[PDB]
Amino acid sequence: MQVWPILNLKKYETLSYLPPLTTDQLARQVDYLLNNKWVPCLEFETDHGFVYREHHNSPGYYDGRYWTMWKLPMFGCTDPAQVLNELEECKKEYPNAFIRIIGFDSNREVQCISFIAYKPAGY
Amino acid sequence: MQVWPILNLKKYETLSYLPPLTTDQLARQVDYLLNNKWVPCLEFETDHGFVYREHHNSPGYYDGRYWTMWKLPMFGCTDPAQVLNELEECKKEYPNAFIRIIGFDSNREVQCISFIAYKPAGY
């Protein structure tokens, strides 16, 4: 009977309960994103990697959900290399940030993909 | 006339005003627990050893009352060694945690026993 850990066990939504993604696996999720014709975009955050409540406590309000946008959504992108390329450029500019890849479905205006792609050391 | 101390005098409910329990004394409380046919269970906490109020201030609400469960309640346990054994295993896995032994009375669904069994250094 194993006891599930308590310390240093922050998680990051979809796919963070699986073993770390190798670069092939990462590339495969971006392919899935592009194959479905969703628009990719990257977001990064250095200060508040996790949700918290500082300005309000009413139902549905949380601080820390919005991260900052890296450049612009890559409309018309079709080459996963282009996406992975931006990831590298962002990483080098913000080595201290959590970075995630999201994909928009403009038709339903819902993000159909969202997963952490890079985490600072210590995490 | 002695003045009762103010600093570093946190307490931990039942039995914490008595001199530290020797291992015989500890074993005796676990016997009392088992003799009454209550179910033992261990709980540990590393972050908030004491009650506090962060998410609400209405009557009866306090944060820090729930600790995390070590394994599962030991239903059917009858040997105090089994309990003291888990204590050792938990201590070695969480040397930095406060750990306590509780005992359930399933009939009334009330904890009839609860006492701190291990404290991190500095405490």
Binding site: - | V3, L9, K10, Y17, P59, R65, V110, C112
Partner: protein, 467 residues
């Protein structure tokens, strides 16, 4: 079929003495200790009690024929003479469920205890017990929280709870009240409380008291790491004022309020109990004025009846006596009503004064509070008579310690944990009581000093109310 109407007065026994009656499970049953005047026979005395407390009057009225009196009348169904007493009987009366308003302890008492104690034909009358049927018990909310929930909210398990009444009763200012509160709480007591008569007075107005006590309780809680509480008294002159005080306690976020249920009243108490259930406040109940009604064995109402009435109306704690302290309370009779307050089922047992078997259909239990003239040397007896589910209060016993409140609290908290450890280890608190306390004095200078002060204080007098 509508026998005719014939004006005139006739014996109550003709209609209200029904020795063949089998009681229904929905009937409210009553055990009265009746002392008739010379020349008035038991059956008539009992029938007269059953009559005026339910449907009848002193002379025949024609309206009885518009209903079915057989189904509404209260009836004396059994009489048993009292051993060793002359001209004293225990008359049992059964009242049908349809006579009571649902959820109103006020209505139950207005019928059963309204006028019968003043009949010219009786010398004295005492209500000893009531069997409240489970169908009537369900129409009540009962305690706002009860024992289990209270321990769960305060995070306190495995030992009685310790409290302390600030003294002098009246006369302290609001800032001084809070100062005395902070010092008692930081020493290890779980609760401090307003004395029963502290409401709002020229020397200290309620809102100033509530405010300063909140600052003090929050300070002691931060210092010790244990949840603390201070009972804020909401007793007041009008329902409106009572609610005002409860509302500010809710706004401060404190865990417990208090009410004097008999001087305040059952109508006001039921309102506060419902409010407490709705707002998460624990409710402590004082029985101020009870001995005016329950002390004497020949006339009045026994405390067990008033304890049952409170569990129905609502309260999380209720003062229940100390047995060994300054106010009356015999051990067996006390253990009897303590069971009626905490348990779900208590079987008939005349040795403890319990005349009827009582079931509570899961109405939560009330925590009994031992308070009144007790001190450190009484700790083993108290832990032994009451057990873990009780609140032991020491007013003079904390504020009378030679070193002040904090050390006074440590003394009581150490004496109690010593008894709990000893008991849990197998020791006999009844026989090793003083050894356990004496042993603790070896490592607790605080306990030691208190032991010196009260070593010779005992309260032993013959009791007035015995089985």
């Amino acid at each position: 079929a509508s026998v005719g109407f014939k004006a005139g007065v006739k014996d109550y026994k003709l209609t209200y003495y029904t020795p063949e009656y089998e009681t229904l499970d929905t009937d409210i049953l009553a055990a009265f200790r009746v002392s008739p005047q010379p020349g008035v026979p038991p059956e008539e005395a009992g029938a007269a009690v059953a009559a005026e407390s339910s449907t009848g009057t002193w002379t025949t009225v024609w309206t009885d024929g518009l209903t079915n009196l057989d189904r509404y009348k209260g009836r004396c169904y059994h009489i048993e003479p009292v051993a060793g007493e002359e001209n004293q009987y225990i008359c049992y009366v059964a009242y049908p469920l349809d006579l009571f308003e649902e959820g109103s302890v006020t209505n139950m008492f207005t019928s059963i205890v309204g006028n019968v104690f003043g009949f010219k034909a009786l010398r004295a009358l005492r209500l000893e017990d009531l069997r409240i049927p489970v169908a009537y018990v369900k129409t009540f909310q009962g305690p706002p929280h009860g024992i289990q929930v209270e321990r769960d909210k305060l995070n306190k398990y495995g030992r009685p709870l310790l409290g302390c009444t600030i003294k002098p009763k009246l006369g302290l200012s609001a800032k001084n009240y809070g100062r005395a509160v902070y010092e008692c709480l930081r020493g290890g007591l779980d609760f401090t409380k307003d004395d029963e008569n502290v409401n709002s007075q020229p020397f200290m107005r309620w809102r100033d008291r509530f405010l300063f006590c909140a600052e003090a309780l929050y300070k002691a809680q931060a210092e010790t790491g244990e949840i603390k509480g201070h009972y804020l008294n909401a007793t007041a002159g009008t329902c409106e004022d009572m609610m005002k005080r409860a509302v500010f306690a809710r706004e401060l976020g404190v865990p417990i309020v208090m009410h004097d249920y008999l001087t305040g009243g059952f109508t006001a108490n039921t309102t506060l109990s419902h409010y407490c259930r709705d707002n998460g406040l624990l409710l402590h109940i004082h029985r101020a004025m009870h001995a005016v009604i329950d002390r004497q064995k020949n006339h009045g109402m026994h405390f067990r009846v008033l304890a049952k009435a409170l569990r129905l109306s609502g309260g999380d704690h209720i003062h229940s006596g100390t047995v060994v302290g300054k106010l009356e309370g015999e051990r067996d009779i006390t253990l009897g009503f303590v069971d009626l307050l905490r348990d779900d089922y208590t079987e008939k047992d005349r040795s403890r004064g319990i005349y009827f078997t009582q079931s509570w259909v899961s109405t939560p239990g009330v925590l009994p509070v031992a308070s009144g003239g007790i001190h450190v040397w009484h700790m083993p007896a108290l832990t032994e008579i009451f057990g873990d589910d009780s609140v032991l209060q020491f007013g003079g016993g904390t504020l009378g310690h030679p070193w002040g409140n904090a050390p006074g609290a440590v003394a009581n908290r150490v004496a109690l944990e010593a008894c709990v450890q000893a008991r849990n280890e197998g020791r006999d608190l009844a026989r090793e009581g003083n050894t356990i306390i004496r042993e603790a004095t070896k490592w607790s200078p605080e306990l030691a000093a208190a032991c010196e002060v009260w070593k010779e204080i005992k309260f032993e007098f013959p009791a007035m109310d015995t089985v």
